[PDB]
Amino acid sequence: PEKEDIMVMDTKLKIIEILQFILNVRLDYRISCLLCIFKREFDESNSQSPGALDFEHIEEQAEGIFGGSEENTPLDLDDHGGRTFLRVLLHLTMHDYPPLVSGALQLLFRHFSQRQEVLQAFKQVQLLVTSQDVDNYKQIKQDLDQLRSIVEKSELWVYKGESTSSYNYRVVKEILIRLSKLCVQESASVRKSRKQQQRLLRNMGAHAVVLELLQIPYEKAEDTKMQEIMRLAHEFLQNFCAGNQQNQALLHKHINLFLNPGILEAVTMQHIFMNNFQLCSEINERVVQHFVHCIETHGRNVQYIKFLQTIVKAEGKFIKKCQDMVMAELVNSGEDVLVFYNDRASFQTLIQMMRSERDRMDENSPLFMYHIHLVELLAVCTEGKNVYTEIKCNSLLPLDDIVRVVTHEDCIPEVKIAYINFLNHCYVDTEVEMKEIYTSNHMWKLFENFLVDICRACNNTSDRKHADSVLEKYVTEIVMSIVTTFFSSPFSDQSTTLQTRQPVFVQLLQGVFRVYHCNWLMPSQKASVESCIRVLSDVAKSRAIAIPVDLDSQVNNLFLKSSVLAASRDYRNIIERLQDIVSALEDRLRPLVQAELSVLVDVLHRPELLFPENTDARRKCESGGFICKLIKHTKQLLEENEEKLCIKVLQTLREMMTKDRGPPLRQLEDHKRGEALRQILVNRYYGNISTSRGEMSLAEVQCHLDKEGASNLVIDLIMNASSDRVFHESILLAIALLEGGNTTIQHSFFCRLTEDKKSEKFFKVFYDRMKVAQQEIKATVTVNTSDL
Amino acid sequence: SSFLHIGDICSLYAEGSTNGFISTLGLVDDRCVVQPEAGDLNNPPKKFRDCLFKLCPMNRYSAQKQFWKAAKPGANSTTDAVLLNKLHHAADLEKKQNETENRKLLGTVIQYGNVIQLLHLKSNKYLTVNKRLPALLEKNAMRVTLDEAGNEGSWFYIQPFYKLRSIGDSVVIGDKVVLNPVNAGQPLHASSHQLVDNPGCNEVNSVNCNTSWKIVLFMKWSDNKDDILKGGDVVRL
Amino acid sequence: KDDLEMSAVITIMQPILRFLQLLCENHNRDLQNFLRCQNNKTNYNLVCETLQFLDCICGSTTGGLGLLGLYINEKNVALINQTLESLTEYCQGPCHENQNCIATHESNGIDIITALILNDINPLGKKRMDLVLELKNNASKLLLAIMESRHDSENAERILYNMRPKELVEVIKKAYMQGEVEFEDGENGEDGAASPRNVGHNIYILAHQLARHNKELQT
Amino acid sequence: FHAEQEKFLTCDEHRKKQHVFLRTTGRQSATSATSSKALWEVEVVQHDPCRGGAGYWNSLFRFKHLATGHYLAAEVDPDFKMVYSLVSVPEGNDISSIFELDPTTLRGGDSLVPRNSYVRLRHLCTNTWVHSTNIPIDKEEEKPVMLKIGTSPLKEDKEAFAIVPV
Amino acid sequence: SPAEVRDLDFANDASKVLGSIAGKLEKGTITQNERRSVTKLLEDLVYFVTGGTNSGQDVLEVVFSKPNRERQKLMREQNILKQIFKLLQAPFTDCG
Ligand SMILES: O=P(O)(O)O[C@@H]1[C@H](O)[C@H](O)[C@@H](OP(=O)(O)O)[C@H](OP(=O)(O)O)[C@H]1O
Ligand SMILES: [Ca+2]
């Protein structure tokens, strides 16, 4: 009925994106005015300089550029106080075109929340420091413009099967290396990240250009200049994502572009996923499995194991889910990925490769660090005292293999970390400790090698420049931990071999004390060194272990002992005053922001008032047609995958049920400011031609919403809730509607449920939503008691 | 049509890489072993009181597990005696009620997707899978043993090996099924490895596989009356 | 450091329980008999699962022997209060089917209710006694609502089987003296209706109906 | 419909010869592959040639292809260890095209056959049992779609077809 | 009685394991494994004849009451006696 032509009805949709931009540019104008306000305030502040900014003078300048002033009429689109702007959106909302009305609903959210939308945008900003900042700004501008010109001129300098192409092949490399260099600087021994240059670069948006360049198809068979260009782009991206967390989130949006079996393309992948708890909490299964499949398909590479080692342990925090998931797929990976030398025949191959690796002469290292990485990743993914990972990893590498490799004379120090610490994380640092470790003399066979290693490390006073830093780290950390965990563990005290090998314990304690005598100890490692000494002293005191008087006296002694200036100042103070002023302005808008948030529901409650009378629009709005149609729109908002809009609409509509009418001194003035702004704004929008609203009682507001179909909306949303947030909001809305024990809504729910044979989904959803809670609570509440 | 019931007595016959009746290695030992060459479904082994299992319903174990944890030497106190007495009384009541529903649930039909416990008649020990220990002969596999009282590892999902029957259907005697512990989540697997101390014996462990446990009926629950004479009984002439 | 905030799956239960209570409020007869059985192909018993949640949250028989102190912490009092309140309206008035469905359940959920009023909650009781007050008040209200003018003996003997007549009469006094102790320095129990006065009174009322099928209780 | 193989029994002409095979689908939902050449009509054998009657477990059945009009019969495998394979025959009065229904679960011999209950095609003329092979019949091509079907003299409890109501 | 057959089977199993333990004794091939496994064997017989649990004290420092009437006959019938004192002198028959 009344089939409006689609080609003419798409017109309004085409005006919608015009409205988007003409509303967006107002934000730039408002933030420019806000910057000018602070320009004036700092101009009057620094000239006098006791430095505090005039907030009581800033507030009216900020509120005079937002609304209710003579010079605020050009910001309003229709130059009529916004009275006629809302009616077009309201009229378009009743139209029968889904994306048109979907955009129309989005427009009014921006129109009412102008105060909110301005403040975050102004709080996200940045500014220039000294002439160096200006130079960097200019250089990055020209570099990006020149690069973009060539990007749109790609088909001229690309071989699809000095000249301009030859000139570009060179000139692009210098600009790419300049953009890469601007990201991170390198000191003598510390790699620091520049947090301001990266912010300027991301504000410019070089990442989009680099990603678009990477997307371009290419042939690596013949032209290696292109291959090194792509590698340089990857290097710049890695430097851009390094040292920051939000850049990694920004680049995460193009993970589907980086599912390639390439090497450096995979090198970018761990840089994207390094040191990010939140980002790794939602890792994709497919990428992780595809990396292992690439190992099984495209040879053995360390770039694929670095990603796994990074994702299993992010931010230094153990990840149980990733730890279990790694060996959930490692078992099915076959022996192609998991290669281990267990028997004597394979151990001989390991030793013959070890000798050549000790020579370090070619064709031995690539297989060498790969096995090192495999063992280290097993150790890292077996932390957390989790039974599953350790039991599954025990099969791949037992204690006997680790003992055999560590006891061999060609074991270089780097190998000792790789297997000794893995032995710790696989047997000692376990919730279910294996009693075979503490009941066997193999542990003392390992102590002997540790004693010889510590004697070697402490005897390195002949060549300081040739000292092994890795060996020092091993001595300071790994042995200390594997001894402290062993002695401090109450379960290991049941071993009867403690008093059978006193002479080796004497020399072991002597060596542990000797480690403290080293002058190369790091402050962090010194605590680890001292912890083992303290644990050994406590164990000796408790077990009455015979110790020589001299060593005991040494331990007791250790225990008992334990122009340019003004120019810098101006901008340095400016930057830190910007944060203060932003915070002050953000604080002095909350009493106002809920005013318009309530104007939302105020206008929605009475949408017919705004339009002039004796009109079809007012006739249809007076009957509740606006809310009724918005209900069926919100019914299908989730279908088109619009979750944020559906949440923001359900939460706003739930405000129809909370009837509120208006340190206590601050709250009083804030509430009065909010009421003062709300009344003037609502009266300006209304323009009805000493008045009282006389709102209808809350008892029949719920019935009025019931008659518009809000009873059906909640049930249908609950059945088809694909997300926890949508279902939670539906539950809150249903609670709000049925407040006070209304019988109309109850009868509507009953009749809908009994008249529809598809309530099975409804009740199954409710049944499962608590069955999952029961399953979780059964495993959650387990503490017993421990006495006072 | 004949259907399974609670209290039925039947054997298990694995089919696949190794085919044979599952069994034990005496009362002193507590290791489940399948013996391939000892017999077949047409030619049963000479000794046939080791392969018999009695179906039992799911039993609560929360109070029993709590009492086991309390009995662990980790908290010693003078007032702990009363708490241990209360826990022992709760466990006793829990065992008594488990026996009551065990009496009351006999004869009910068994359907796919249910939870069942296997009681070895000879050793009077339930079949259990421990989730913290690996198999003695197989490292990547999972440990399977026996226990007199049982724990949460004794619960077994019953699932169809064939697509003919789905969850909710009653189990018909003679169909190959798959056993899955509730907690271990891995089917019982008949390994092809050989025990060192016993020739021919094959270890039974818990790992993903394609082994089907063809249940073979031996005696119905109704026939299981103590006051009558029934096959397999031992008497004196 | 110390968040002490339960799983979100646990939290989502509370608005679900409140929403379920809201439909059954006002003694709307059409819903108490609907939630229990829906006359569909696969009807789910909402009352049974609501009782199961309370049974599992309290450890069932493990917590039914004076273990309320450890299970009931200062964070899940709101959830259990909402659970008890929600259970109340399922059987309010002459809702015989829900009373039968709750009292004759296969689980031991009734035991938690019965022992809730007797056993204390430490260290909650010594720190926040008021929470124990409204918890026991809601338990007493549920216990009165489960009987709710019932003539049969099966429900009465079911409640009495787990509860000997002696300790009811004992806890009547054990809920009496401290009621006067609170008044010795100012009680103000009119606004604070959770005072031990009404708490003991409700238990006395419950014993009044329970005594009709116990020849020893009236002694 | 084959329950285990998840494939539909089909009769078609290849290389100017009619063959009966078990067509292989190419998607996850094997049941949805409803083909128009997989329709078979049930003929209950009766003394009266014009009487169709009802269906019983002990009754004798004949299956006729709807589109082609050919009967389902078993004959000695030319390769011959599957001695017998299922083919199409135009003649109807022979006893070689007579089958029996064996229920998966034991049922009485005087009970009405449900429309959608799994059954086993127990051949009667040769007293063998139906069995799904795994040897494709079209060697000249590259992607096997058609698989030959034979008879197992020893009974198997996994090869039970499904009577899909049309 | 259902317990009598279990007792007979337990006694016969304890007899046959010791039969294999002492069968290789003459050749001196008994090792730690055949020593560790049989070490826990002896603890079983005493609680089998006594029918009691473990007291938690030293295994040699437990004095029991009168023994079971019937299980003493079972050990003699099932040739457990033939090996119970053969085990004690077995290590002396082993290496050395
Ligand atoms: O979905 P698409 O893209 O159209 O392609 C389908 C696909 O080729 C299936 O393999 C085919 O079933 P078969 O392999 O059994 O032939 C089906 O045929 P159908 O549509 O006739 O079922 C096609 O529709
Ligand atoms: Ca027998």
Is chain D touching chain C, with at least 3 CB–CB pairs below 8 Å?
A: no
Per-residue CA distances from A43 to A40, A47, A59, A261, C195 (Å):
5, 6, 17, 57, 66
CA-nearest of A198, A204, A159, A205 to A180 is A198
Instruction: Please tell me the distance from the alpha carbon of residue D123 to that of residue B12, in angstroms, as a whole number.
Output: 31
Q: Please tell me if the CB atom of residue D25 comes closer than 6 angstroms to any atom of ligand 1.
A: yes
Cross-strand partners of B5: B109
Both tokens assigned to D29: 């939902």
Q: What are phi and psi of A410, to 5 degrees?
A: -85, 10
Length of chain E: 96
Residue minimizing CA distance to atom 9 of ligand 1? D26
* Cα angle A210, A212, A216; round to 5: 115
User: Are the beta carbons of D64 and D72 closer than 8 angstroms?
Assistant: yes
Answer positive or negative: Cα dihedral of A359, A363, A364, A365: positive
Per-residue CA distances from A559 to A54, A527, A535 (Å):
57, 13, 12
Return the CATH architecture of domain B5-223.
Trefoil (2.80)
Q: What contacts B137, CB < 8 A, 6 or more positions away?
A: B191, B193, B195, B203, B205
Length of chain B: 237
Burial (0-12, 13-18, 19+ Cβ within 10 Å), A43: exposed
Per-residue CA distances from A681 to A23, A672, A674, B155 (Å):
19, 14, 11, 68
For residue B168, which residues of chain C lie inside 8 Å, CB to CB? Answer: none
In A430-505, which ranges are E strands? none
For residue C127, which residues of chain A lie inside 8 Å, CB to CB? Answer: none
User: Are the beta carbons of E37 and B29 closer than 8 angstroms?
Assistant: no
Q: Which long-range contacts (CB under 8 A, 24 or more apart) does D31-35 make?
A: D31/D1, D31/D6, D33/D8, D34/D8, D35/D8, D35/D10
User: Are the beta carbons of A351 and A401 closer than 8 angstroms?
Assistant: no
Q: How many CB atoms lie within 10 A of CB A219?
A: 12
B121 contacts chain E (CB < 8 A): no
**Closest-approaching ligand to the CA atom of B11:** 2
User: Are the beta carbons of A207 and A251 closer than 8 angstroms?
Assistant: yes
Q: How far is ligand 2, taken at its centre, from the CA of residue B38, in Å?
A: 15
User: Are the beta carbons of D83 and D69 closer than 8 angstroms?
Assistant: no
User: What's the longest Cα–Cα distance across chain E?
Assistant: 47
Q: How many CB atoms lie within 10 A of CB C51?
A: 22
* Cα angle A144, A147, A151; round to 5: 130
Instruction: Please tell me the distance from the alpha carbon of residue C219 to that of residue A249, in angstroms, as a whole number.
Output: 75
Q: Which long-range contacts (CB under 8 A, 24 or more apart) does B227-232 make?
A: B232/B48, B232/B49, B232/B52
H helix or E strand, kind and range, residue D22: strand D17-23
Q: How far is ligand 1, taken at its centre, from the CA of residue D25, in Å?
A: 9
CB contact under 8 A, B172 and D118: no
User: Are the beta carbons of A137 and A200 closer than 8 angstroms?
Assistant: yes
Q: Find out whether the peptide bond into C123 is cis, omega within 30 degrees of 0.
A: yes
- For A505-531, the DSSP string reads HHHHHHHHHHHHT-TT--HHHHHHHHH
Q: What contacts B156, CB < 8 A, 6 or more positions away?
A: B115, B116, B117, B118, B127, B179, B180, B181, B182
Residue minimizing CA distance to atom 11 of ligand 1? D26
Give A313 to chain C, closest Cα distance, Å. 20
Instruction: Please tell me the distance from the alpha carbon of residue A364 to that of residue A356, in angstroms, as a whole number.
Output: 7
CB contact under 8 A, B62 and C65: no
Q: Which long-range contacts (CB under 8 A, 24 or more apart) does A327-335 make?
A: A327/A381, A327/A388, A327/A389, A327/A392, A327/A393, A329/A288, A329/A289, A329/A292, A330/A292, A330/A392, A331/A392, A331/B140, A333/A292, A333/A295, A333/A296, A334/A296
Instruction: Please tell me the distance from the alpha carbon of residue B61 to that of residue B95, in angstroms, as a whole number.
Output: 9
- For E28-90, the DSSP string reads T---HHHHHHHHTHHHHHHHHHH-----SS-TTS----SPPTTHHHHHHHTTHHHHHHHHHHH
Instruction: Please tell me the distance from the alpha carbon of residue A309 to that of residue A381, in angstroms, as a whole number.
Output: 8
For residue B92, which residues of chain C lie inside 8 Å, CB to CB? Answer: none
Q: Is A691 helix (H, G, I), strand (E, B) or coil?
A: coil
User: Are the beta carbons of B97 and B138 closer than 8 angstroms?
Assistant: no
Which of C60, C65, C66 comes nearest B62 by C-beta? Answer: C60
CB contact under 8 A, D4 and B174: no
Both tokens assigned to A492: 């290991």
Q: What is the DSSP letter of B158?
A: E
User: Are the beta carbons of B53 and B6 closer than 8 angstroms?
Assistant: no
How many whole angstroms from its chain centre is CA A275? 10
Q: What contacts E42, CB < 8 A, 6 or more positions away?
A: E87
Count how many Cα atoms sit within 13 Å of the Cα of residue B108 in the half-sphere of its side chain: 12
Burial (0-12, 13-18, 19+ Cβ within 10 Å), A300: middle
**Closest-approaching ligand to the CA atom of B44:** 2
Atom of ligand 1 nearest to the CA of D25: 15
User: Are the beta carbons of A236 and A268 closer than 8 angstroms?
Assistant: no
User: Are the beta carbons of C55 and A772 closer than 8 angstroms?
Assistant: no
User: Are the beta carbons of D135 and D106 closer than 8 angstroms?
Assistant: no
- Which chains reach chain E with 3 or more Cβ–Cβ distances below 8 angstroms? B
Residue positions of D in the annotated binding site for 1D-myo-inositol 1,4,5-trisphosphate? 23, 25-27
User: Are the beta carbons of A142 and A130 closer than 8 angstroms?
Assistant: no
CB contact under 8 A, D158 and B1: no
CB contact under 8 A, E13 and B122: no
Q: What are phi and psi of D76, to 5 degrees?
A: -65, 130
User: Are the beta carbons of A66 and A118 closer than 8 angstroms?
Assistant: yes
User: Are the beta carbons of C140 and C117 closer than 8 angstroms?
Assistant: yes
Q: How many CB atoms lie within 10 A of CB D26?
A: 9
Both tokens assigned to B9: 């007595």
Which of A735, A769, A780 comes nearest C12 by C-beta? Answer: A769
Give B19 to chain C, closest Cα distance, Å. 41
Q: What is the DSSP letter of E14?
A: H
Residue C25 annotated in ligand binding:
yes
Domain ranges of chain B: 5-223
Both tokens assigned to D55: 């269906």
Resolution (angstroms) equals: 3.5
- For A342-388, the DSSP string reads -SHHHHHHHHHHHHHHHHT-SSSHHHHHHHHHHHHHHHHHT-TT-HH
Give the nearest chain D residue to B175 (CA atoms): D157
Count how many Cα atoms sit within 13 Å of the Cα of residue A614 in the half-sphere of its side chain: 0
The residue with tokens 């040897």 is D135
* Cα angle A653, A726, C78; round to 5: 90
CA-nearest of C66, C53, C44, C64 to C17 is C53
Q: Please tell me if the CB atom of residue D49 comes closer than 6 angstroms to any atom of ligand 1.
A: no
- The one-letter amino acid at B38: A
For residue C66, which residues of chain B lie inside 8 Å, CB to CB? Answer: 86
Pocket test for ligand 1, best of D27, D29, D143 (most atoms within 8 A of CB): D27
CA-nearest of A75, A91, A99 to A17 is A99
Both tokens assigned to E87: 């085990």
CA-nearest of B204, B201, B231, B209 to B38 is B201
For residue D3, which residues of chain B lie inside 8 Å, CB to CB? Answer: 162-164
Both tokens assigned to A22: 């003409």
Residue minimizing CA distance to atom 2 of ligand 1? D27
Give the nearest chain C residue to B64 (CA atoms): C62
Q: How far is ligand 1, taken at its centre, from the CA of residue D139, in Å?
A: 22
CA dihedral A584, A588, A590, A595 (to 10 degrees): -160
- Which chains reach chain A with 3 or more Cβ–Cβ distances below 8 angstroms? B, C
Q: Please tell me if the CB atom of residue D32 comes closer than 6 angstroms to any atom of ligand 1.
A: no
For residue B90, which residues of chain C lie inside 8 Å, CB to CB? Answer: 61-62, 64-65
- The one-letter amino acid at B13: Y
Quote the crossing angle between the two packed helices A302-312 and A365-381, to the nearest 10°. Answer: 20
H helix or E strand, kind and range, residue B143: none
Q: How far is ligand 1, taken at its centre, from the CA of residue D10, in Å?
A: 16
User: Are the beta carbons of B49 and B121 closer than 8 angstroms?
Assistant: yes
How many whole angstroms from its chain centre is CA C132? 12
CA dihedral A315, A319, A324, A328 (to 10 degrees): -40
Q: What is the DSSP letter of A493?
A: G
Quote the crossing angle between the two packed helices B80-104 and B62-71, to the nearest 10°. Answer: 150
Q: Please tell me if the CB atom of residue D33 comes closer than 6 angstroms to any atom of ligand 1.
A: yes
CA-nearest of A154, A164, A161 to A222 is A161
Per residue, the 3-state secondary structure of C105-173, as one string, reads CCCCHHHHHHHHCCCCCCCHHHHCHHHHHHHHHHHHHHHHHHHCCCCCCHHHHHHHHCCCHHHHHHHHH
CB contact under 8 A, C34 and A750: yes
Quote the crossing angle between the two packed helices A698-705 and A743-755, to the nearest 10°. Answer: 20
The technique is: cryo-EM
User: Are the beta carbons of B55 and B107 closer than 8 angstroms?
Assistant: no
* Cα angle C170, C175, C180; round to 5: 130
